[PDB]
CSV table of C-alpha atoms in Angstrom, one decimal:
chain,number,residue,atom,x,y,z
A,1,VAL,CA,16.2,14.5,-3.5
A,2,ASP,CA,18.3,13.1,-6.6
A,3,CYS,CA,16.3,12.0,-9.6
A,4,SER,CA,19.1,10.4,-11.4
A,5,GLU,CA,18.4,7.3,-11.2
A,6,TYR,CA,15.0,7.7,-13.0
A,7,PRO,CA,12.8,6.8,-14.9
A,8,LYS,CA,11.2,3.9,-13.0
A,9,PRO,CA,8.7,1.7,-14.4
A,10,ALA,CA,7.0,1.5,-10.7
A,11,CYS,CA,7.1,3.1,-7.9
A,12,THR,CA,5.4,2.2,-4.1
A,13,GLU,CA,2.6,4.1,-3.4
A,14,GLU,CA,2.9,5.0,0.3
A,15,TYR,CA,2.2,9.1,1.1
A,16,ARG,CA,4.9,11.4,1.5
A,17,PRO,CA,4.3,14.3,-0.3
A,18,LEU,CA,6.4,17.0,-1.9
A,19,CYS,CA,5.6,20.1,-3.5
A,20,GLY,CA,6.5,20.7,-7.5
A,21,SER,CA,7.4,24.0,-9.5
A,22,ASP,CA,4.1,23.5,-11.0
A,23,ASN,CA,2.3,24.1,-8.1
A,24,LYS,CA,1.0,20.4,-7.5
A,25,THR,CA,2.1,18.0,-4.5
A,26,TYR,CA,3.9,14.9,-6.0
A,27,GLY,CA,2.4,12.2,-3.4
A,28,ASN,CA,6.1,10.7,-2.9
A,29,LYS,CA,9.5,10.7,-4.3
A,30,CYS,CA,9.3,7.9,-7.0
A,31,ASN,CA,6.2,9.7,-8.5
A,32,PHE,CA,7.9,13.4,-8.2
A,33,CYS,CA,10.7,12.1,-10.0
A,34,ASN,CA,9.2,10.0,-12.7
A,35,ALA,CA,7.3,13.6,-13.8
A,36,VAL,CA,10.5,15.4,-13.9
A,37,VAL,CA,11.8,13.3,-16.5
A,38,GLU,CA,8.5,13.2,-18.2
A,39,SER,CA,9.1,17.0,-18.2
A,40,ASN,CA,12.6,16.7,-19.5
A,41,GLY,CA,14.2,18.2,-16.6
A,42,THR,CA,11.8,21.4,-16.3
A,43,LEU,CA,10.0,20.1,-13.3
A,44,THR,CA,11.9,21.2,-10.0
A,45,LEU,CA,10.9,20.8,-6.0
A,46,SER,CA,9.9,23.9,-4.4
A,47,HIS,CA,9.8,22.7,-0.7
A,48,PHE,CA,9.2,19.5,1.3
A,49,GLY,CA,5.6,18.4,1.9
A,50,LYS,CA,2.2,19.2,0.4
A,51,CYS,CA,1.8,22.7,-1.7
B,1,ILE,CA,-11.1,1.0,11.1
B,2,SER,CA,-11.0,-2.2,7.6
B,3,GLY,CA,-9.4,-2.4,5.0
B,4,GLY,CA,-8.8,0.2,3.0
B,5,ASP,CA,-8.5,3.0,6.0
B,6,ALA,CA,-5.2,5.2,6.5
B,7,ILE,CA,-2.9,4.1,8.7
B,8,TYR,CA,0.5,6.2,10.0
B,9,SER,CA,3.4,6.0,10.5
B,10,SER,CA,6.6,8.2,11.7
B,11,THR,CA,7.4,8.6,8.3
B,12,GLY,CA,4.1,8.7,5.7
B,13,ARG,CA,0.8,7.0,5.0
B,14,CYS,CA,-0.2,4.1,3.9
B,15,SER,CA,-3.7,1.7,3.9
B,16,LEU,CA,-4.6,-0.5,6.5
B,17,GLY,CA,-5.1,-4.0,3.9
B,18,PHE,CA,-6.8,-7.0,6.2
B,19,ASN,CA,-7.6,-7.3,9.8
B,20,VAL,CA,-6.2,-10.6,10.7
B,21,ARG,CA,-6.1,-12.5,13.8
B,22,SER,CA,-4.7,-15.8,15.5
B,23,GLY,CA,-6.3,-16.8,18.3
B,24,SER,CA,-7.1,-14.6,20.7
B,25,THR,CA,-4.5,-11.7,18.8
B,26,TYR,CA,-5.3,-9.5,16.9
B,27,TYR,CA,-3.3,-7.2,13.7
B,28,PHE,CA,-3.6,-5.8,10.1
B,29,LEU,CA,-1.7,-6.4,7.2
B,30,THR,CA,-0.1,-3.7,4.8
B,31,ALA,CA,2.8,-3.5,2.4
B,32,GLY,CA,5.9,-4.4,4.0
B,33,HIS,CA,7.6,-1.2,2.4
B,34,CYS,CA,5.4,0.3,4.8
B,35,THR,CA,6.3,-1.6,7.8
B,36,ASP,CA,9.9,-1.1,6.7
B,37,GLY,CA,11.8,0.7,9.5
B,38,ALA,CA,8.4,1.7,11.2
B,39,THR,CA,7.6,1.3,14.4
B,40,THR,CA,4.3,2.1,15.9
B,41,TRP,CA,1.4,2.6,13.9
B,42,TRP,CA,-1.6,5.2,14.2
B,43,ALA,CA,-4.9,5.8,12.5
B,44,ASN,CA,-5.0,9.6,12.6
B,45,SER,CA,-2.7,12.1,11.1
B,46,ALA,CA,-2.2,13.7,14.5
B,47,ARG,CA,-1.0,10.7,15.6
B,48,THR,CA,-3.5,10.8,18.5
B,49,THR,CA,-5.0,7.3,18.0
B,50,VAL,CA,-2.4,4.5,18.3
B,51,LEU,CA,-3.3,1.4,16.5
B,52,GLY,CA,-0.2,-0.6,17.3
B,53,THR,CA,3.4,-1.8,16.8
B,54,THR,CA,5.0,-3.5,13.5
B,55,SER,CA,5.5,-7.2,14.0
B,56,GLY,CA,6.7,-8.5,11.3
B,57,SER,CA,8.1,-6.6,7.6
B,58,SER,CA,9.2,-8.4,4.4
B,59,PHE,CA,10.0,-6.3,1.5
B,60,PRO,CA,12.0,-5.9,-0.5
B,61,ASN,CA,11.1,-9.4,-2.5
B,62,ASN,CA,8.0,-9.8,-0.6
B,63,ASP,CA,5.8,-6.6,-0.1
B,64,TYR,CA,3.8,-7.8,3.2
B,65,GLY,CA,4.0,-6.5,6.5
B,66,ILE,CA,1.9,-7.2,10.0
B,67,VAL,CA,1.2,-4.5,13.0
B,68,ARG,CA,-0.1,-6.0,16.6
B,69,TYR,CA,-3.1,-3.7,17.7
B,70,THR,CA,-2.4,-2.3,21.1
B,71,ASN,CA,-5.4,-0.6,20.9
B,72,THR,CA,-7.9,-2.3,23.2
B,73,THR,CA,-10.7,-0.6,22.6
B,74,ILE,CA,-10.9,0.6,18.1
B,75,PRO,CA,-13.4,-1.5,16.1
B,76,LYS,CA,-11.1,-3.7,14.4
B,77,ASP,CA,-13.9,-4.7,11.3
B,78,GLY,CA,-13.2,-7.8,9.2
B,79,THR,CA,-14.3,-5.4,6.4
B,80,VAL,CA,-12.8,-3.8,3.8
B,81,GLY,CA,-15.0,-0.3,4.2
B,82,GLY,CA,-18.5,-2.2,4.1
B,83,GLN,CA,-17.4,-4.9,2.3
B,84,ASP,CA,-17.7,-8.5,4.7
B,85,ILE,CA,-14.4,-10.9,3.5
B,86,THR,CA,-15.3,-14.3,4.4
B,87,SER,CA,-11.5,-16.4,2.8
B,88,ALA,CA,-8.9,-15.5,1.1
B,89,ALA,CA,-8.2,-16.5,-3.1
B,90,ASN,CA,-5.3,-17.3,-5.2
B,91,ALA,CA,-6.0,-15.0,-7.9
B,92,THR,CA,-6.9,-15.8,-11.4
B,93,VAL,CA,-5.7,-14.5,-15.0
B,94,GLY,CA,-9.0,-12.3,-16.1
B,95,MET,CA,-10.1,-11.6,-12.2
B,96,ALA,CA,-12.6,-9.2,-11.2
B,97,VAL,CA,-10.3,-7.2,-8.9
B,98,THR,CA,-11.4,-4.2,-6.3
B,99,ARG,CA,-9.1,-2.2,-5.0
B,100,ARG,CA,-9.6,0.0,-1.6
B,101,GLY,CA,-7.1,2.7,-0.4
B,102,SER,CA,-6.6,5.9,1.5
B,103,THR,CA,-6.0,8.3,-1.1
B,104,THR,CA,-8.1,7.3,-4.0
B,105,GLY,CA,-10.9,5.1,-2.5
B,106,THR,CA,-12.6,1.9,-4.1
B,107,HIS,CA,-11.5,1.0,-8.0
B,108,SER,CA,-12.2,-1.7,-9.9
B,109,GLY,CA,-10.3,-3.6,-12.4
B,110,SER,CA,-9.3,-6.9,-13.3
B,111,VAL,CA,-5.9,-9.3,-13.4
B,112,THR,CA,-4.3,-9.1,-16.3
B,113,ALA,CA,-1.0,-11.4,-15.4
B,114,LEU,CA,0.4,-13.5,-12.2
B,115,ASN,CA,4.1,-13.8,-10.6
B,116,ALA,CA,5.2,-10.5,-11.8
B,117,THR,CA,8.9,-8.9,-11.4
B,118,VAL,CA,8.4,-5.0,-10.0
B,119,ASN,CA,11.8,-3.3,-10.0
B,120,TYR,CA,11.2,-0.7,-8.1
B,121,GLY,CA,15.5,0.5,-8.0
B,122,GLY,CA,18.3,0.7,-5.9
B,123,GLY,CA,17.9,-3.4,-5.4
B,124,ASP,CA,14.2,-3.3,-4.2
B,125,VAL,CA,12.7,-6.2,-6.2
B,126,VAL,CA,10.2,-7.7,-5.5
B,127,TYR,CA,8.7,-10.6,-7.2
B,128,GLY,CA,5.5,-13.1,-7.6
B,129,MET,CA,3.2,-10.4,-7.9
B,130,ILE,CA,-0.1,-10.3,-8.9
B,131,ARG,CA,-0.3,-7.2,-11.9
B,132,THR,CA,-4.1,-5.5,-12.7
B,133,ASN,CA,-5.3,-2.8,-15.1
B,134,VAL,CA,-6.7,-1.2,-11.5
B,135,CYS,CA,-5.3,2.1,-11.3
B,136,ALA,CA,-3.5,3.3,-7.3
B,137,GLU,CA,-2.4,6.4,-6.4
B,138,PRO,CA,0.1,7.2,-3.0
B,139,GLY,CA,-1.2,6.6,0.1
B,140,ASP,CA,-2.9,4.2,-1.3
B,141,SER,CA,-0.1,1.3,-0.7
B,142,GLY,CA,-0.8,-1.6,1.5
B,143,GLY,CA,-4.2,-1.5,0.7
B,144,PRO,CA,-6.9,-4.7,-0.2
B,145,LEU,CA,-7.4,-5.7,-3.0
B,146,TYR,CA,-10.5,-8.4,-3.0
B,147,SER,CA,-13.1,-9.8,-5.6
B,148,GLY,CA,-16.6,-10.4,-3.7
B,149,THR,CA,-15.7,-11.3,-0.4
B,150,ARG,CA,-12.7,-13.2,-1.2
B,151,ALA,CA,-9.8,-11.2,0.3
B,152,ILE,CA,-6.7,-11.7,-2.7
B,153,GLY,CA,-3.8,-9.2,-2.3
B,154,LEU,CA,-2.4,-6.1,-0.7
B,155,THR,CA,-1.5,-2.5,-2.8
B,156,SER,CA,2.5,-2.9,-3.3
B,157,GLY,CA,3.1,-0.2,-6.0
B,158,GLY,CA,2.3,0.3,-9.8
B,159,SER,CA,2.3,2.9,-12.8
B,160,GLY,CA,-0.1,5.7,-14.3
B,161,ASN,CA,-2.7,7.2,-11.9
B,162,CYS,CA,-6.8,6.8,-11.2
B,163,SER,CA,-7.7,9.5,-14.1
B,164,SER,CA,-5.7,8.3,-16.9
B,165,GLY,CA,-5.8,4.6,-16.1
B,166,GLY,CA,-2.6,2.0,-15.0
B,167,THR,CA,-1.5,-0.7,-13.8
B,168,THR,CA,-1.0,-1.6,-10.3
B,169,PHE,CA,1.0,-5.1,-8.4
B,170,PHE,CA,-0.6,-6.7,-5.4
B,171,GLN,CA,1.7,-8.7,-3.3
B,172,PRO,CA,-0.3,-12.1,-3.0
B,173,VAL,CA,-2.5,-12.2,0.3
B,174,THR,CA,-2.6,-16.1,1.1
B,175,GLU,CA,1.5,-15.8,1.3
B,176,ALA,CA,1.7,-13.6,3.9
B,177,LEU,CA,-1.4,-15.5,5.6
B,178,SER,CA,0.6,-18.4,5.7
B,179,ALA,CA,3.4,-16.9,6.4
B,180,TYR,CA,2.5,-15.1,10.0
B,181,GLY,CA,-0.4,-18.0,10.4
B,182,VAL,CA,-3.3,-15.4,10.6
B,183,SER,CA,-5.5,-15.6,8.7
B,184,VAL,CA,-9.0,-13.1,8.0
B,185,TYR,CA,-12.3,-13.4,10.5
């Protein structure tokens, strides 16, 4: 999980979840990485899969 | 199993778009990004109920794939949830449409633009897309976009979410039907 190529204006919608440091399950890498950007780099990856 | 239901591959979960057929052979359409690199498809997370195997996949550029049914007993309804689908049609600006997907269920809105290009990154660009004001979330990929009893499109991707509102792009279903020589029923 590298979010360097983010943000992206749109994400595909397949489900392959990641667990954020905010305890939120992100539905895919694309969603997760746009959140990272939106948080200005404060959100991180806790672990793979659902929280 | 009908349009909008969950489907699982070895990698993740998508939504079944539409059940289609050609002669006596049954398949289902879903998103190409979901069929890319998937072989076998199952109806549950436990992977115990087999659906079939990928027969074709077109992504990026387009965003559609088809799976041939190997499961002989599962019911293959020509509906979306309980909604009957009797034909396919082309999207038009201002058309009232509905999407159904395995994560968010059923949501409605309208077509705001045609022939849009969506760039998902690293060379994954899709062209010819239908834009709408319908939301969608991870898991919803490949579910149906319909209008009444008319099949219109397959969920591809977008931005925003169902809580706060969003924009979703769909692959025109007509193009997929024609590519594979199949039809809705």
